[PDB]
């Protein structure tokens, strides 16, 4: 048992074909750990500002200077998370965003493999490290599961049966789980990605006023990783069991953006409730992580509202206890989608909420005038001193 | 034809409308069934004033009113009441549930499928009107309907009509007293619409009116009827300038030209001076000076805020009855010499005056005494900041733990419409703090050229 | 038009429902034969909340009676108001659950739930604008608990956006009538915590205390307890049926009373209550009603509020009264007892007023509290449950009906988590680290 510190990272995407075809203007600026945004409809008022753990400028893909390369973000998040998984403890990766921002790129990456996402690289490193340590005394096992949560009802994405609502149980020692959840073994990342495509074809997706293909239900691809050791003895014993969770979120929305009734309103409301509960639990976990980490005290165990949603309930083991987590959030550079980008920031700011301060860029003219006035004063005080004035 | 369309939203709006329309019917001699026997007894006249009532062929008079709510109960009380024949049968009442102290339920989910009918009937009323002056919207902060549906309706009206004035009378939450646990959320979420779209918003507090009733009228156990009657008197004093002749008449545009220095500070307080019981109506002169002084007493304010802690930015006095200009001039002159009343240094005039000949009426069964003179003061000041600040604190105490939030997000909103509103409140308070500061000393720093 | 479907399962639920329909029919002036003979014209204005109209200018309630034993149905029919109910809403079987939760939920109730759902759906489809459902049952029993939980689960599956109330009679430490109370109570709470919007906590111990010490009844019987309960249920939804100065729907109560989804267990109370001869000695005023409502002995849950903090409270007054008195009294109650109210809610007293009082009274009031102290109740059940589950006292009677040992553990863990959630907002500061 240990902390659950959360690493917050935000990346911007380049202009798509439609945006580059138009004369749309960029609106996101980044510097250090700060990201600032300007209203196109109120250019006179002020920019808004936010501060995250990592700001990534992937606006220009071929660029080298201050370019957020895929390998850089991997080394920042995925490599450390995979190492923590290999140590024998759980880890989880949250993908949050809205259609247009481009979350699925960073969540998967392109097929060319020169520009890869977190997941294919993680799978490659996982199986490379596994195959590079298969000595005589060590045995390794890996298996994968894939399931969705739609309107707080769990469904299986791989099994082709009727998409019924699976039952959620609580094993006394192993925690929450889902009954009749098909679990398959894998040996190469090609099989993992093929299963991913097969399951992604089965997702529940509906057309919105924002995009014609939007995720209407949360989805998780969970990797269970078991290590067995054979000491100088007749017994082969499982050392540790760790999990790598790859959670995909359905982004928030407003009824104004999609003013449709019936199923759409219910889906949006349930998604928003799930996001609110998830943010609350992650914020409480981060606060408890920060507190003891510096104080080393044990203020009981707090109360973490896991049960308020099935999403947080299933991910109880990965969220809490000893673990490490990191949420990646995608943005959109188009001015027209301002209401989306700022909204994502308000969700990305949650958990590890830190002071942002105001980004100040003084006028060069005023700076020059002030510097020259100070220089005149200094030189006059020097000359009057040596009785030369 | 100085026509004005009244809109009533929510239970508070409908009940204040009942009081207001009782007073209006009594003022012009209209019976509850819409007939006016005064013209028949006399022979003819202009007594069917087109400000509020529209005359049909058969001598009936239909009010220019629009009642809206989501509960059938509050307006079914009116459909089978004393005034059932006065109103048009169309009352725009959704036969469903209510916003349930939920801004999201009233703005996004259930506010739809009733807004279209309301806008259609408002258009039908506006088509009959020539030279429409503006709108008078009655609602209440802290309620689901009066917040969400009022926001939606104001947005649509600003989109459609645009240039017509839109005055607002709203019941603000009291500092201590309250009737709901989620009042602060609904109150804060309405700032965007009450700021961006309205032209002038008048706020009243139930605690202040209860104090006034207990102390002045000697009513130990008031109900909402007395409060609605007082608010009706206020609105009648505001609107009388365009119904009756007078020495100096103040239209609804002079209001906005004189009272709001900048677009974002249009939140004036209101007060009524000669609030006195019948027994205490004797032993008192009720001259212009007395009522004018009583308008400035902090005890008589209709919102729990002390003007002594702020600065007066603009004042508008509206007198009714046997009043003459020279008494008003003397009252203003003696007021300007008091050091307890401070005006901003950048408004040296600081007063707008209007006079009307028609004295105020007395409702049978009421509690206000018959008087010869009256005055209603509307005062744009900076003390109103306090009224926001307390409420702002309350909001924080609930939003730190995200209490009661799942109800709001389950209807269409996300958490950001819950922060954006808070930031807008903070910006408004900063503006009110900035405007009231005295001009910097010799505002051109200092000056003096050769000669 | 807000309309409520009433369901009553088990002996306790059926008896309370019969008394409740007696009370409501008296309030709306309905004859036992179903005709109307009232006097005030406002009684028919909102009669469609509970009653359907029938061709002979008759009125029939929307009650749906359920029981796995036909004796209680025979008792209900052979009663003062038996003829009022529709014959087709008497859904029942034979070979009752026999105090076995498994039989009520899995084996026996699973076959009758289809017929009950058919009747419920038939009543639902004829409703102009349905608001919610009501259920009356006993957690510590057999058919009532299991079938009520199963019906709640099915209905919430079918009607997710509708309100669901529950007037559940939970067991007591001292007054216990069945030996397998803890298992049934635990397994029932495990479902109620998830699939219910509002739950009202009732137990016979508090009602007996009220009868002994307030009404001064020498020999109270179940009729009087049902009378008090029925008074509460009629008080809760008064604003749907009669006009008011400040209305309060069921959804308004749910929004104002429930801060978080899992905290929806309420402590009910009613005022005034006087013992006949004492009636002339005490005046009826809003201060007296407020004093009696917040008194510790008036609660019908056997949980002392003084051992916790009120997360929220709601008051529904009936009668012609001044709003200033109500607001002043609630503010005074909040200010004086500052230590018994949670600090991080600025104002946690909802108030509603209705003009029309009960028939023979000038003023009345209903009180709905939500305080941390309710955890005590759950704790007591847990304190018994483990004491029987550790040794598997009567477990085989359950496992022979399809159930499993893991499910008991999930129920216990869920109740413990609920108790912890209530317990967190219960200490009167959090400063030290
Ligand atoms: C006539 C009069 O002034 O006498 C009262 C009376 O003496 C008292 C003691 C009544 C009386 O109640 C009881 O004795 C009683 C006994 C056991 C359990 C519950 C009540 C009364 O019986 C009860 C009766 O109440 C009503 O009629 C209400 O409308 C009540 N309905 C019924 O009791 C009822 C009974 C049979 C069939 C149908 C309805 C009600 C309460 C809440 C919501 C709706 C209706 C009243 C006025 C009285 C008597 C007759 C003595 C009380 O009744 C209530 C619950 O309001 C008990 O304490 C109150 C206060 C009253 O002072
Ligand atoms: N002065 C005055 N205030 C009132 C009156 N009626 C209600 N209010 C105020 O309104 C607040 C409650 O909100 P409401 O306006 O009643 O909400 P609503 O219009 O019924 O809309 P819903 O919440 O959906 O039912 C209370 O806090 C009161 O202070 C009234 O008759 N006179
Ligand atoms: N750093 C990046 N560099 C280049 N392209 C990017 C980058 N981030 C995102 N993208 C784009 O993201 C697109 C894929 O996502 P897109 O189709 O825009 O939304 P989506 O993924 O389908 N919905 P969502 O997953 O919620 O964001 C690709 O066409 C990429 O061009
Ligand atoms: N208030 C009240 N409670 C009752 C009544 N009958 C039984 N109970 C309670 O209900 C419990 C028994 O449950 P029971 O009604 O037999 O459940 P059922 O067999 O499913 O109908 C006991 O602990 C009693 O306290 C009644 O008439 N009134
Ligand atoms: Mg209402």
TrEMBL record, chain C:
Note the superkingdom of the native organism.
Eukaryota
Q: Which PROSITE patterns match?
A: TUBULIN (PS00227), TUBULIN_B_AUTOREG (PS00228)
Q: What cofactor is needed?
A: Mg(2+)
Q: Report residues binding GDP 2.
A: 11-12, 138, 141-144, 175, 177, 181, 204, 222, 226
SMART domains named in the record: Tubulin, Tubulin_C
- Residues engaged in binding Mg(2+) 1: 11, 177
> Where along the chain is Mg(2+) 2 bound?
177
The UniProt entry's sequence similarity note says: Belongs to the tubulin family.
What subunit structure does UniProt give? Dimer of alpha and beta chains. A typical microtubule is a hollow water-filled tube with an outer diameter of 25 nm and an inner diameter of 15 nM. Alpha-beta heterodimers associate head-to-tail to form protofilaments running lengthwise along the microtubule wall with the beta-tubulin subunit facing the microtubule plus end conferring a structural polarity. Microtubules usually have 13 protofilaments but different protofilament numbers can be found in some organisms and specialized cells.
Q: What does this protein do?
A: Tubulin is the major constituent of microtubules, a cylinder consisting of laterally associated linear protofilaments composed of alpha- and beta-tubulin heterodimers. Microtubules grow by the addition of GTP-tubulin dimers to the microtubule end, where a stabilizing cap forms. Below the cap, tubulin dimers are in GDP-bound state, owing to GTPase activity of alpha-tubulin.
Quote the protein name from its UniProt record: Tubulin beta chain
- The species is Sus scrofa
């Amino acid at each position: 048992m240990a902390g659950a510190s959360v690493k917050v990272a935000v990346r911007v995407r380049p202009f798509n074909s439609r945006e580059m075809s138009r004369d749309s203007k960029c609106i996101i600026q980044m510097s250090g750990s700060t990201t600032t945004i300007v209203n196109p409809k109120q250019p006179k008022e002020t920019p808004k500002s936010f501060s995250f753990d990592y700001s990534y400028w992937s606006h220009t893909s071929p660029e080298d200077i201050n370019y957020a390369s895929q390998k850089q973000v991997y080394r920042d998040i995925g490599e450390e998370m995979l190492q923590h998984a290999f140590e024998g403890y759980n880890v989880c990766i949250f993908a949050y965003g809205q259609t247009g921002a481009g979350k699925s790129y960073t969540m998967m990456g392109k097929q060319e493999k020169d520009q890869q996402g977190i997941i294919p690289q993680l799978c490659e490193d996982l199986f490379s490290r596994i195959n590079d340590t298969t000595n005589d005394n060590m045995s390794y096992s890996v298996e994968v599961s894939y399931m969705e949560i739609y309107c707080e009802r769990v469904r299986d994405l791989l099994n082709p049966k009727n998409k019924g609502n699976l039952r959620v149980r609580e094993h006394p020692l192993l925690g929450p789980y889902v009954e009749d959840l098909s679990k398959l073994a894998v040996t190469s990342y090609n099989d993992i990605q093929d299963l991913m495509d097969s399951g992604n074809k089965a997702r529940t997706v509906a057309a919105t006023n924002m995009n014609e293909t939007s995720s209407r239900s949360h989805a998780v691809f969970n990797i269970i990783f078991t290590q067995k050791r054979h000491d100088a003895e007749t017994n082969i014993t499982t050392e540790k069991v760790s999990k790598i969770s790859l959670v995909d979120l359905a982004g928030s929305e407003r009824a104004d953006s999609t003013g449709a009734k019936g199923t759409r309103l219910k889906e949006g409301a349930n998604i928003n409730k799930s996001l609110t509960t998830l943010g609350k639990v992650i914020s409480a976990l981060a606060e408890m992580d920060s507190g003891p980490n510096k104080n080393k005290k044990k203020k009981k165990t707090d109360f973490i509202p896991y049960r308020d949603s099935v999403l947080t309930w299933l991910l109880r083991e990965n969220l809490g206890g000893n673990s490490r987590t990191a949420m990646v959030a995608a943005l959109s550079p188009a001015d027209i989608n301002y209401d989306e980008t700022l909204s994502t920031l308000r969700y990305a700011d949650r958990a590890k909420q830190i002071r942002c301060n105001a980004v100040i860029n003084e006028d060069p003219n005023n700076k020059l005038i002030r510097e020259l006035k100070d220089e005149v004063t200094r030189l006059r005080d020097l000359l009057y001193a040596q009785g030369l004035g | 034809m100085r026509e004005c369309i009244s809109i009533h939203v929510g239970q508070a709006g409908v009940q204040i409308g009942n009081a207001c329309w009782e007073l209006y019917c009594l003022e012009h001699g209209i019976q509850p069934d819409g007939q006016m026997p005064s013209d028949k007894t006399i022979g003819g006249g202009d007594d069917s004033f087109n400000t509020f009532f529209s005359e049909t062929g058969a001598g009936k008079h239909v009010p220019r009113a629009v009642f809206v709510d989501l509960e059938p109960t509050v307006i079914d009380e009116v459909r089978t009441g004393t005034y059932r024949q006065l109103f048009h049968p169309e009352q725009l009442i959704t036969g469903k549930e209510d916003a349930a102290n939920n801004y999201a339920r009233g703005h996004y989910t259930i506010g739809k499928e009733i807004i279209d009918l309301v806008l259609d009937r408002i258009r039908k009323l506006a088509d009959q009107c020539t030279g429409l002056q503006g709108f008078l919207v009655f609602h209440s902060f802290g309620g689901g309907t009066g917040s969400g549906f009022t926001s939606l309706l104001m947005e649509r009206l600003s989109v459609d009509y645009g240039k017509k004035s839109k005055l607002e009378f709203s019941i603000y939450p009291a500092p201590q007293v309250s009737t709901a646990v989620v009042e602060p959320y609904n109150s804060i979420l309405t700032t965007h619409t009450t700021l961006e779209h309205s032209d002038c918003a008048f706020m009243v507090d139930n605690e202040a009116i209860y104090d006034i009733c207990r102390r002045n009228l000697d009513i130990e156990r008031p109900t909402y009827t007395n409060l609605n009657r007082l608010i009706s008197q206020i609105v009648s004093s505001i609107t009388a300038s365009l119904r009756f002749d007078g020495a100096l008449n103040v239209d609804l545009t002079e209001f906005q030209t004189n009272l709001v220095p900048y677009p974002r500070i249009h939140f004036p307080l209101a007060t009524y001076a000669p609030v006195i019981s019948a027994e205490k109506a004797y032993h008192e002169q009720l001259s212009v000076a007395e009522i004018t002084n009583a308008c400035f007493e902090p005890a008589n304010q209709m919102v729990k805020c002390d003007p002594r802690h702020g600065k007066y930015m603009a004042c508008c006095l509206l007198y009714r009855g046997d009043v003459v200009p020279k008494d008003v001039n003397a009252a203003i002159a003696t007021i300007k010499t008091k050091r307890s009343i401070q005006f901003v240094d950048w408004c040296p005039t600081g007063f707008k005056v209007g006079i009307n000949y028609q004295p105020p009426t007395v409702v049978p069964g009421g509690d206000l005494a018959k008087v010869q003179r009256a005055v209603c003061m509307l005062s744009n000041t900076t003390a109103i900041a306090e009224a926001w600040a307390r409420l702002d604190h309350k909001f924080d105490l609930m939003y730190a733990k995200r209490a009661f939030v799942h109800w709001y997000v389950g209807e269409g909103m996300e958490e950001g419409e819950f922060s954006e509103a808070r930031e807008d409140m903070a910006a408004l308070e900063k503006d009110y703090e900035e405007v009231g500061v005295d001009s910097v000393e010799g505002e051109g720093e200092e000056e003096g050229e050769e000669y | 038009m807000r309309e409520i479907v009433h369901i009553q399962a088990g002996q306790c639920g059926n008896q309370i429902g019969a008394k409740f329909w007696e009370v409501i029919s008296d309030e709306h002036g309905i004859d036992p034969t179903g005709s109307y003979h009232g006097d005030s014209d406002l009684q028919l204005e909102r009669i469609n909340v509970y009653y359907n109209e029938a061709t002979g200018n008759k009125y029939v309630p929307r009650a749906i009676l359920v029981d796995l034993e036909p004796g209680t149905m025979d008792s209900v029919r052979s009663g003062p108001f038996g003829q009022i109910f529709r014959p087709d809403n008497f859904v029942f079987g034979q070979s009752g659950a026999g105090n076995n939760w498994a039989k009520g939920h899995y084996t026996e109730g699973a076959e009758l739930v289809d017929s009950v759902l058919d009747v419920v759906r038939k009543e639902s489809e004829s409703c102009d604008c349905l608001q919610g459902f009501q259920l009356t049952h006993s957690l510590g029993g057999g058919t009532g608990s299991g079938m009520g939980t199963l019906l709640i689960s099915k209905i919430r599956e079918e009607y997710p956006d509708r309100i669901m109330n529950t007037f559940s009679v939970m067991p007591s430490p001292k007054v216990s009538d069945t030996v397998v109370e803890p298992y049934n109570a635990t397994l029932s709470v495990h479902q109620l915590v998830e699939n219910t919007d509002e739950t009202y906590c009732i137990d016979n111990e508090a009602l007996y205390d009220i009868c002994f010490r307030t009404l001064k009844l020498t020999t109270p019987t179940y009729g009087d307890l049902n009378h008090l309960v029925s008074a509460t249920m009629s008080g809760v939804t008064t604003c749907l049926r009669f006009p008011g100065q400040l209305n309060a729907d069921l959804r308004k109560l749910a929004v104002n009373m429930v801060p978080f989804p899992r905290l929806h267990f309420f402590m009910p109370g009613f005022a005034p209550l006087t013992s006949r001869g004492s009636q002339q000695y005490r005046a009826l005023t809003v201060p007296e009603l407020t004093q009696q409502m917040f008194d510790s002995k008036n609660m019908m849950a056997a949980c002392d509020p003084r051992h916790g903090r009120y997360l929220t409270v709601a008051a529904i007054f009936r009668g012609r009264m001044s709003m200033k008195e109500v607001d002043e009294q609630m503010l005074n109650v909040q200010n004086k007892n500052s230590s018994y109210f949670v600090e991080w809610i600025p104002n946690n007293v909802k108030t509603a007023v209705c003009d029309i009082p009960p028939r023979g009274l000038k003023m009345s009031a209903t009180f709905i509290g939500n305080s941390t102290a309710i955890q005590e109740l759950f704790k007591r059940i847990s304190e018994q449950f483990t004491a029987m589950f550790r040794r598997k006292a009567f477990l085989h009677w359950y496992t022979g009906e399809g159930m499993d040992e893991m499910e008991f553990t999930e129920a216990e863990s869920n109740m413990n988590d609920l108790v912890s959630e209530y317990q967190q907002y219960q200490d009167a500061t959090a400063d030290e680290q």
